Amino acid sequence: YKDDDDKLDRADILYNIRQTSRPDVIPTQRDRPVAVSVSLKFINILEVNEITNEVDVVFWQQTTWSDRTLAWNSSHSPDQVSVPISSLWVPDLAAYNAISKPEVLTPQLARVVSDGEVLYMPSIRQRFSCDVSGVDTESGATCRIKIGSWTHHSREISVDPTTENSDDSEYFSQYSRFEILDVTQKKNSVTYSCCPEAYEDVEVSLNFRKK
Amino acid sequence: DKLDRADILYNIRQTSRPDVIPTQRDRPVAVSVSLKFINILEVNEITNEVDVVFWQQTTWSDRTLAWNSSHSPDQVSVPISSLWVPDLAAYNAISKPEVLTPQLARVVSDGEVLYMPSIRQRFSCDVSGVDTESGATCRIKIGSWTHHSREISVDPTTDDSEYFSQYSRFEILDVTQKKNSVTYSCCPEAYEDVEVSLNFRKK
Amino acid sequence: DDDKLDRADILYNIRQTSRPDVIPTQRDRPVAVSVSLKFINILEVNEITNEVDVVFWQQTTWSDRTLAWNSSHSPDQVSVPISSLWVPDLAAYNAISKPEVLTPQLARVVSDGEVLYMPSIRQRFSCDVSGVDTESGATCRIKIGSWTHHSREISVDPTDSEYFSQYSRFEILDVTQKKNSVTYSCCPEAYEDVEVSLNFRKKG
Amino acid sequence: DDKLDRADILYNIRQTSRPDVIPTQRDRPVAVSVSLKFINILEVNEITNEVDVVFWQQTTWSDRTLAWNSSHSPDQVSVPISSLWVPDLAAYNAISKPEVLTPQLARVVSDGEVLYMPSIRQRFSCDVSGVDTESGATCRIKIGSWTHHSREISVDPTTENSDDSEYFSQYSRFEILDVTQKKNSVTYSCCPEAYEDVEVSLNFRKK
Amino acid sequence: KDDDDKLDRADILYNIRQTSRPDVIPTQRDRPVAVSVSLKFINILEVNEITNEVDVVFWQQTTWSDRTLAWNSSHSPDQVSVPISSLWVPDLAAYNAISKPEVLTPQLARVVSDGEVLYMPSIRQRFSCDVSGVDTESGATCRIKIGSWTHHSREISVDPTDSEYFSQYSRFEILDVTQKKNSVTYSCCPEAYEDVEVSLNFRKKG
């Protein structure tokens, strides 16, 4: 703050974050799962198949977590900096019903806050297999997207689904063939017969309609 | 906590040889492959081609990666570039395997390594009778590309209802796997591969 | 100017001072980043889906005057791979494809410390196409800003078809680039963005 | 087998192996053998004269500086091809990048032979006329080095096809009739020297 | 006949990487670097009559010299293959390309012992150009601008030069190909940038 556009300060913070960050290791502070907070803000619904139950969409994946080893006294340093994600540890998030690669359309940077929180918001385009039934009714279709960690169980990573549907058309495209009805993010946990340990995910329920 | 996990990752990088196969004694390295399908995206009966998504459940061990986890974590997530991985290939594939998931493996304390990419990939196989109640049966041949049977053995394993999409255009009747071997006129040595047979039909 | 030795040394100097991940802010002032798009063709237009497939030259310029040298007996500009430089993390907010880059990824660094960067980009967008079969034409807006830097770190300044292709199915009516400000009911600080207005139509 | 034997052989290869320099022993060209074994014909366009196919590029050449005594050690190993010199093979009538569908590894034999066989999907312009008849279409593919003279790289075409059935998809909408490979040396106004290739001729038709 | 001393080739390659400067224009004598560019078309695949776009495959014959790479070819090879990773290469771009160039060949060059570098990627790119009368006897006449992307004329000068490499199975034939020197000057920047106009005149067959 104040002296925020201090280039030397910024260089040093980044040097520090690199001396300290370990990108392949989960920043479990203590014992608790890393609380990974995830929220999708959709931008567009591009392609929709009534027949094959497949949607093409574009969403901003608002993602956050803390690694307080990264932290620093921002008394006379800047409050945040931007850091290429290849430098930081990043939750290994994935969509379990994804049917195409997550396509990132944005620079792969993240903000680190002086308190050790990281804000990561990539713009993603991706296809899913989900219920497209009734997309032309006016109760609308409801497409459910499941996202959590691919390899870290619940005692290692937990998903917080805190989200608001009020600001939703601050994000969505005025020019879509579709319109958003509601977005519902519910936290739940999934186990698997083969395997111990429950994996936290957020279930993002996308309610939408052809205009 | 994470200084343990950090140090376990250091040990893995010390010992691991991502390019050399971890042969115990003079035994083959035993690889378990088990496909659990999630989607069947496209199917052509005129060309005999299929576009599927599946979780490739894979396990083997390297005991040199093992550690005493009395008072340290039991497993850790590790980037597969740091480990040896079986060089597996679907012999009858017709697209590159597109991996949909972070390329991370789980390394267990005993030296077991758990790796399971979600894969999207296209195959040429028998689609005759997809529109029929008895369904088409498509076999996918997965084995090692460079290691013959004395270096790598591929052992199948395993139920399917817990993975496959309800919203699919198709349903799964049955998925069965069997160990198979591959030889060639030109080439001495046999190659193990698992034959996954996907029996399926339109809803 | 072309004395090769001067050039290898200027590039060595730049790689010593260049901090490719750190913003070149000076005097606790933002980095000023002029952006201007020069459209080069409009390849595919879809009026049912409101998507446009365009190819454009993105004139980008800003300065880091630590990179400066005394060119009194030295070349005034050099070409420098952008791997070696900080670059504004520009993104198009209503893009729907990743920016496919058709050109060598070099920049020109000028002895005064100004950096001239201009990639040819083909990218699909979600914009307004209604009226493209009308003489007043479609108007399609593209919003470009920094992805992670708010206004106090990065500013984006605003500024015919000397560039546009004469073999496109479409003709350009006008282009206007106004500097608008973005905030969200979410995050405190404003983001500086240049809204580019492309008014164009089909020929007939 | 024996892991540290295998590790050590890898170390040895990475000491001696020069991935960017041709392995010319006793000053004559590197012989490269090339055998294509088609796995499927996925798409043919009869009017645009283009075929899309899948094949196994059986490639072998020798690099004797790579050799070791295999009395009490493995006979071959697997090696990532980026640790090795590979021939710079190209298909002159290819109209798409080669899409390698398999692990990019090779087998180094203890006599210094390299064994490399990528599975490849590529599109070619060739003759697809008569694909619906039964003398068939014959699609000629031309492969050779992109930058090396016959004096630097030589191309062995030796090739059987009695075993075509072992490779080709039974479920293809086409059937192979024959595949013959002929060496062929080409000169260029550009350059003094001639560059060898191999014509592969894919005589095929629908079923 | 000493083209094959493998150790000799190792050392030349060693010498090249020591002297080479992959990100520095190799300007001799305060000359601009002279780059010859020459296209030998191979195919024309997807001509679209309405969008006015064509899809071509062509071998970009490209050459220039860097005398600092030169060695005595007296008792050593005349040329060597070298990865372009290790050499400077002109930042050439097709100004009216609407797709990225897709290089279909190993990205190597030949360095001759005089410092001449021969570089020829086979390329497959999509262009926005005049495709009027493709199925007439006059043909379509599609022109392609290829120049340095960041170097002006005092830095790089681009110089020009049948149908001997064009595919007979193409649905098109080549009438003529002409290549002209050219400049350019934008109401934006002072200097002029040299380019090459390549004029491909062609038509459907029959």
Ligand SMILES: COc1ccccc1-c1cc(N(Cc2ccccn2)Cc2ccccn2)nc(N)n1
């Ligand atoms: C509360 O919502 C969030 C939760 C977690 C992480 C990020 C956000 C977030 C950040 C955010 N910006 C900062 C930011 C941080 C980091 C990366 C990119 N951006 C602002 C902004 C402005 C213009 C383009 C893009 N992003 N904007 C929105 N809508 N949400």
Ligand SMILES: COc1ccccc1-c1cc(N(Cc2ccccn2)Cc2ccccn2)nc(N)n1
């Ligand atoms: C027999 O089962 C296996 C055999 C070998 C390897 C993996 C498995 C396995 C692991 C597994 N998970 C852990 C894991 C290990 C490693 C990588 C990713 N995941 C659970 C889980 C849950 C939610 C998303 C993802 N993975 N889940 C399933 N179904 N199978």
Ligand SMILES: COc1ccccc1-c1cc(N(Cc2ccccn2)Cc2ccccn2)nc(N)n1
């Ligand atoms: C206002 O003009 C600009 C502002 C900022 C950055 C670049 C430009 C600019 C540069 C420019 N050239 C130099 C250049 C600099 C750097 C990179 C590429 N090119 C000339 C030229 C000519 C033929 C192809 C390409 N570029 N041309 C145009 N029209 N604009």
Ligand SMILES: COc1ccccc1-c1cc(N(Cc2ccccn2)Cc2ccccn2)nc(N)n1
């Ligand atoms: C005459 O045979 C060849 C000549 C030259 C190069 C390779 C071969 C070759 C090798 C070969 N295998 C070894 C190998 C070496 C290297 C890479 C992959 N494989 C076995 C095998 C069998 C099933 C799938 C994969 N590979 N199989 C066949 N059919 N041909």
Ligand SMILES: COc1ccccc1-c1cc(N(Cc2ccccn2)Cc2ccccn2)nc(N)n1
């Ligand atoms: C006037 O001719 C040229 C001018 C400038 C640059 C290249 C050439 C050139 C070189 C050339 N060959 C050498 C070479 C050098 C380097 C890379 C690839 N090849 C021969 C050859 C052989 C087989 C495939 C391809 N090219 N062939 C043709 N047609 N043109």
Ligand SMILES: *[C@@H]1O[C@H](CO)[C@@H](O)[C@H](O)[C@H]1NC(C)=O
């Ligand atoms: C941060 O630094 C300031 C220096 O003025 C100091 O007063 C303050 O106590 C420090 N805070 C912490 C938590 O160390």
Ligand SMILES: *[C@@H]1O[C@H](CO)[C@@H](O)[C@H](O)[C@H]1NC(C)=O
């Ligand atoms: C592992 O280490 C613990 C102490 O850390 C020791 O008591 C034990 O004997 C060791 N071995 C096994 C198999 O637990």
Ligand SMILES: *[C@@H]1O[C@H](CO)[C@@H](O)[C@H](O)[C@H]1NC(C)=O
């Ligand atoms: C640059 O150098 C020249 C001579 O080397 C000198 O005359 C001049 O004062 C220096 N500084 C500037 C800003 O030109």
Ligand SMILES: *[C@@H]1O[C@H](CO)[C@@H](O)[C@H](O)[C@H]1NC(C)=O
């Ligand atoms: C191989 O090794 C053995 C023992 O090291 C040695 O006696 C022999 O001469 C070597 N060469 C051959 C061809 O056996």
Ligand SMILES: *[C@@H]1O[C@H](CO)[C@@H](O)[C@H](O)[C@H]1NC(C)=O
């Ligand atoms: C090397 O070059 C020099 C001068 O360019 C010449 O005198 C000599 O004949 C050449 N060959 C050898 C072997 O020195």
